[PDB]
Design a protein around this nucleic acid. Structure first.
Ligand SMILES: [Mg+2]
Ligand SMILES: [Mg+2]
Ligand SMILES: [Mg+2]
Ligand SMILES: [Mg+2]
Ligand SMILES: [Mg+2]
Ligand SMILES: [Mg+2]
Ligand SMILES: [Mg+2]
Ligand SMILES: [Mg+2]
Ligand SMILES: [Mg+2]
Ligand SMILES: [Mg+2]
Ligand SMILES: [Mg+2]
Ligand SMILES: [Mg+2]
Ligand SMILES: [Mg+2]
Ligand SMILES: [Mg+2]
Ligand SMILES: [Mg+2]
Ligand SMILES: [Mg+2]
Ligand SMILES: [Mg+2]
Ligand SMILES: [Mg+2]
Ligand SMILES: [Mg+2]
Ligand SMILES: [Mg+2]
Ligand SMILES: [Mg+2]
Ligand SMILES: [Mg+2]
Ligand SMILES: [Mg+2]
Ligand SMILES: [Mg+2]
Ligand SMILES: [Mg+2]
Ligand SMILES: [Mg+2]
Ligand SMILES: [Mg+2]
Ligand SMILES: [Mg+2]
Ligand SMILES: [Mg+2]
Ligand SMILES: [Mg+2]
Ligand SMILES: [Mg+2]
Ligand SMILES: [Mg+2]
Ligand SMILES: [Mg+2]
Ligand SMILES: [Mg+2]
Ligand SMILES: [Mg+2]
Lengths: 100, 155, 54, 95, 210
RNA sequence: GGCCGCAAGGUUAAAACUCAAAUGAAUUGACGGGGGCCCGCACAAGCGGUGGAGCAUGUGGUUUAAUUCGAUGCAACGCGAAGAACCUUACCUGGUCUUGACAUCCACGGAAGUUUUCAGAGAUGAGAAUGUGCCUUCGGGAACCGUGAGACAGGUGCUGCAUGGCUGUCGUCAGCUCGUGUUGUGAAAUGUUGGGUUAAGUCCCGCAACGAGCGCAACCCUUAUCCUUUGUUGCCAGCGGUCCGGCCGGGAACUCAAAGGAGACUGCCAGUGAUAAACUGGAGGAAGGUGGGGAUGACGUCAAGUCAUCAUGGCCCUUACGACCAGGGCUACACACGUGCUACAAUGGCGCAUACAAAGAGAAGCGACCUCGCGAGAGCAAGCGGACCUCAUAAAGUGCGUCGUAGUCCGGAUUGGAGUCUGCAACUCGACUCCAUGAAGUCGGAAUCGCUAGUAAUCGUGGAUCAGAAUGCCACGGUGAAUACGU
């Protein structure tokens, strides 16, 4: 991945978990049926204001070795490629080829 | 295949009439693994065969079976530009398989309401030399009779 | 598929087929006198049948 | 004979399309029962290449040829398939 | 065709893992990235210490790292000046208290990874690739390898076209699973581009999973 | 040109020009519409499909401001992508940036943060409030920020025909070789051929060969039977009690869980066979001759695939091929091809009633029970990092009723209206819900594919990716066939 692309993921994480609470509670009123029309309407304008890159849906799991955007695995935080490379050295405890 | 297939299977006999023969007949009618559905359809046909011939079931369904088994089939063989149809004996077990297949094939190709009706009617007609099933055997036999000259080739 | 066919029978039909197609005895690939007898046995039966074929 | 053209490192213009179609129309006289057929043109460095694959009535015939042009490549290719198609026909009309 | 990684296939059967801890999914990916970094660091700055393997355990909110070498002197230092430094700057990135050990490789010529680099070094110094390859297979068998194979590939002797050459002597049975075969690789960076090296060393067959 | 001949022609017999070869015998391969022998869903015997329809999806074409880049006979076309509204994103349009979004080095300034207003689509620009920290030995160094200079960073730019690494393929086919010896002037040959045998260069016997190595087989996982140990969150045979619910006290039998063992070796017995190797049959046994399934891929081939995973030789860009942002595009549609799903009905549709699985996932995640709603869902909130809690009621099946062979009570595409949920946000472009609508399709030309047993066929269940977005992919059980004469 382009250094830039790796970087955006850091800008995006950092924000996401700084405005995390602000978003949550500012959302919480939106979905409150039993609340002031005055309040909720304000909120809708207020959420859309604080920055896009601060949303958790905005980020993309990239291999934390090569930066790849595709073929990611959560258990290892690596791409299918780097998982295999490390598997075979025995740098992933337990993991090994399987048959049944 | 080029070698010999070892290990023939075991058909369990019918729950009712306790025949391996009829058990095969079910499998042949069976579709998409639905053995119970087929088990029903078969018995309800024999009921209605029994209820008209009045000649038992495992002894009536037989009489259909005899009117339709072939005794001589034709194999094809490419000779020059041409293809020789050649007559051959039929194995006992094979002529069972064919009779049971032709009966089923003839049944389905009818306009009656149930499957059970179609089978029943067909089995009845079989017993009186009538339906498509029995027509087919006649035709097979006609063809082997025609090109009898090629009876003894081994080629 | 699970087990090899009868070697004697096969040897007898290989004999027949070289026979009808008109190869010479002494093409026979067997020296095992047992299989050899089957091969020639076929080859000579076939020699009869060729006559009445065209 | 249904045709299909590819270009792997080549832009199929409307000579190279028109040309290739005309040249392939001959092949049916060698064997009447040709079905769909796929053509591929390549340029790797200096080598011009052209392969086609021909679904026929009981078979699959393939050949590839190299020219110094693509026209000369396709000219070569048509001579290769001709011979294969004739061979096929003759081992069916085998009486 | 392609061939299975001879280490990977024998992992449970007759080889150990290099990292041996346990973790739940929550911290599994995190221990991996942490480990990677420590190896990435150690190998970088022990380049010239002849290091074979970095086995690395996480016992209980900690990390002991036990790093095999055929030049322990150079790693240790003057009653352990360098080792403590490494310790200091591992705990730095492990994020936990760290401790380091030094295993001794007695026969550096019978170590797939060591010999692999041995060559890769020579090749970097414009040494003749056949000499490097030929020398290794001698050394190995001389010291009681039951077999040895070395492959080298790329633009050998700066050739405009790439090829792949390999010598074997002795037994190197890759299909036998209990067969302890030690395997490892090393890229060499000539001015023509990358020359890859691969090495297989058979030490004999084993009769017990252990 | 001469001579000979009735003629056909014979005989004698040049040159210009042009090529760097043309030829003989033998050698290794490859190939033959040559031969022999053995195999293979190769044919044959059979079962269900694809090609016709609607829809999903990939590709070609056209189109486009852009429709990002790659994969292309078998071995590209539900392929890289295990999941494109924004992001991703590499493309287009417009708006900006210039030692730079991402590092190290130096000087200078300022703790880092925190809270606000305005302009702007936003990037960004301009303000405003508050804050003055930790070792510092009396200079502050350590943060981490802002400005400045330039050594630099940066490039999913080009070449897979400069490469490493990884991968497909012939092919899990039974092959591929070497040392020494011997033969030949020599390329080479012998071994590796021959007789048998085998799934197998498998084994045996012969033999100018004697040996060895990579493969084959075995060692590994799984499944089938038994035994020992251990017994909760699993188990209930014998007892006693019961709110009749393993529910309770108990029990350690049984099922099951998982460590350790036992077991199959042609070992035992006939017949054949070169006193061999093996073969065919029999016994016992849960299992019989490689028991079933997986993992495992020889020397090599195809300048096969990947410079867009990463690395990397070279080449190129550097106030732009680098960097930021909003909106769009990858989802376009006269059309062609590939892979799928759902159908065309009665072995079936619809309604009520009622049985029997396996495997797997869950942490700020799986989310019961209760209340609300026709429904998607909503609110409230137990339990569970799990043989305990939750996802989560298997379906086909079965009984009873109905429809009665109709373009139908078959099909469910299309479209209007009305909603829900995820998410800054579902116009372009999400999934789902209710009401209405009710298309093509009556079993598919030439061609063509899969499969030999718990297989095909058919029925449900889970997972990876993942805010949301499967008819795809990877897994799991239920029911469960057909037929192999043969070459
Ligand atoms: Mg990079
Ligand atoms: Mg996302
Ligand atoms: Mg021409
Ligand atoms: Mg492989
Ligand atoms: Mg003259
Ligand atoms: Mg004259
Ligand atoms: Mg010659
Ligand atoms: Mg041949
Ligand atoms: Mg067939
Ligand atoms: Mg068919
Ligand atoms: Mg079509
Ligand atoms: Mg269609
Ligand atoms: Mg494309
Ligand atoms: Mg490219
Ligand atoms: Mg986008
Ligand atoms: Mg622009
Ligand atoms: Mg290549
Ligand atoms: Mg390419
Ligand atoms: Mg000599
Ligand atoms: Mg050979
Ligand atoms: Mg040889
Ligand atoms: Mg020879
Ligand atoms: Mg032999
Ligand atoms: Mg061997
Ligand atoms: Mg037996
Ligand atoms: Mg093996
Ligand atoms: Mg290429
Ligand atoms: Mg954008
Ligand atoms: Mg697409
Ligand atoms: Mg279907
Ligand atoms: Mg309906
Ligand atoms: Mg999930
Ligand atoms: Mg309700
Ligand atoms: Mg098979
Ligand atoms: Mg399914």
């Amino acid at each position: 991945a382009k250094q830039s692309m790796k970087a955006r993921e850091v800008k995006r994480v950092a924000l996401a978990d700084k405005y995390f609470a602000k978003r949550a509670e500012l959302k919480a009123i939106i979905s409150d049926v039993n609340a002031s029309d005055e309040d909720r309407w304000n909120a809708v304008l207020k959420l859309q204001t604080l920055p896009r890159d601060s949303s958790p849906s905005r980020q993309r799991n990239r291999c934390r070795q090569t930066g790849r955007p595709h073929g990611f695995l959560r258990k290892f935080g690596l791409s299918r490629i780097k998982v295999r490379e490390a598997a075979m050295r025995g740098e992933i405890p337990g993991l090994k080829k399987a048959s049944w | 295949p080029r070698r010999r297939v070892i290990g023939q299977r075991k058909i369990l006999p019918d729950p009712k009439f306790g025949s391996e023969l009829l058990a095969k007949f079910v499998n042949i009618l069976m579709v998409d693994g639905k053995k119970s559905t087929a088990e029903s359809i078969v018995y309800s046909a024999l009921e209605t065969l029994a209820q008209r011939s009045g000649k038992s079931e495992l002894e009536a369904f037989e009489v259909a079976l005899e009117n339709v088994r072939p005794t001589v089939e034709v194999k094809s063989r490419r000779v020059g530009g041409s293809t020789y149809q050649v007559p051959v004996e039929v194995r006992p077990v094979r002529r069972n398989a064919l009779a049971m297949r032709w009966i089923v094939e003839a049944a389905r190709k009818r306009g009656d309401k149930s499957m059970a009706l179609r089978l029943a009617n067909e089995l009845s007609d079989a017993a009186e030399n009538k339906g498509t099933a029995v027509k087919k055997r006649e035709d097979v036999h006609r063809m082997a009779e025609a090109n009898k000259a090629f009876a003894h080739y081994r080629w | 598929k699970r087990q090899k066919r009868d070697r004697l029978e096969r040897a007898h039909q290989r004999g027949y087929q070289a026979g009808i197609a008109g190869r010479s005895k002494e093409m026979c690939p067997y020296q095992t006198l047992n299989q050899r007898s089957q091969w020639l046995g076929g080859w000579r039966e076939a020699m009869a049948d060729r006559v009445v074929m065209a | 004979m249904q045709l299909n053209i590819t270009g792997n490192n080549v832009e199929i213009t409307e000579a190279l399309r028109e040309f290739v179609t005309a040249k392939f129309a001959k092949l049916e006289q060698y064997f009447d029962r040709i079905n769909q057929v796929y053509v591929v043109l390549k340029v790797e460095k200096v080598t011009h290449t052209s392969d086609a694959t021909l679904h026929v009535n009981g078979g699959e015939i393939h050949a590839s040829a190299e020219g110094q042009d693509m026209y000369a490549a396709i000219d070569g290719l048509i001579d290769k398939l001709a011979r294969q198609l004739t061979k096929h026909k003759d081992k069916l009309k085998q009486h | 065709g392609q061939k299975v990684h001879p280490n990977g296939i024998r992992l449970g059967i007759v080889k150990p893992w290099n990292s041996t801890w346990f973790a739940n999914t929550k911290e599994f990916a995190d221990n991996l990235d942490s480990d990677f970094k420590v190896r990435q660091y150690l190998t970088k700055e022990l380049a010239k210490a002849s290091v074979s393997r970095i086995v690395i355990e996480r016992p209980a909110k900690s990390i002991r790292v036990t790093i095999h070498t055929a030049r322990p002197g150079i790693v240790i230092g003057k009653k352990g000046e360098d080792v403590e430094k490494l310790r200091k700057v591992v705990a730095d990135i492990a994020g936990v208290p760290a401790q380091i050990n030094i295993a001794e490789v007695r026969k550096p010529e019978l170590d797939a990874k060591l010999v692999a680099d041995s060559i890769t070094s020579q090749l970097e110094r414009r040494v003749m690739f056949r000499r490097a390859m030929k020398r290794a297979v001698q050394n190995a068998m001389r010291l009681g390898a039951k077999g040895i194979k070395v492959e080298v590939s790329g633009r050998l002797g700066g050739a405009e076209i790439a090829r792949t050459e390999w010598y074997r002597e002795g037994r190197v049975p890759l299909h036998t699973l209990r067969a302890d075969i030690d395997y490892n690789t090393s890229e060499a960076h000539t001015t023509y581009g990358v020359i890859g090296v691969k090495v297989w060393i058979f030490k004999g067959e084993i009769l017990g999973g252990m």
